Structure 1
Amino acid sequence: FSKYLSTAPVIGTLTAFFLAGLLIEINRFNPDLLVYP
């Protein structure tokens, strides 16, 4: 099952699930970041 999670669709998804949720949580505490202040 660990050798299944190393396959491309799952590790393409959970890291994209990680990188999206990184960006989602950023816009909740830091909303509307147009420019560097």
Structure 2
Amino acid sequence: FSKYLSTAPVIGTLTAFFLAGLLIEINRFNPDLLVYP
């Protein structure tokens, strides 16, 4: 079953998921990261 997870589009969205998932919690955590403090 896990060989289906290795294919191109499922890994082109689940790594697109957590990477977009990282930007979104850190903005909810730390709003307006405009300048390096």
SS for the counterpart of 2:18 is helix
The alpha carbon displacement at 1:17 in A equals 0.3
CA RMSD in angstroms comes to: 0.5
Q: Could you state the TM-score of these two structures normalised by the residue count of structure 2?
A: 0.93
Where structure 1 has 5 or more consecutive residues not aligned to the other structure, the ranges are none
Identity of aligned residues (%): 100
Q: Classify the secondary structure of the residue corresponding to 2:31.
A: coil
Deviations 1:5-37 (A, max 9, x none): 000100110000010010000100100010101
Give the gaps of 5 or more residues in structure 2.
Answer: none
Q: Distance in 1 between matches of 2:12 and 2:25?
A: 20
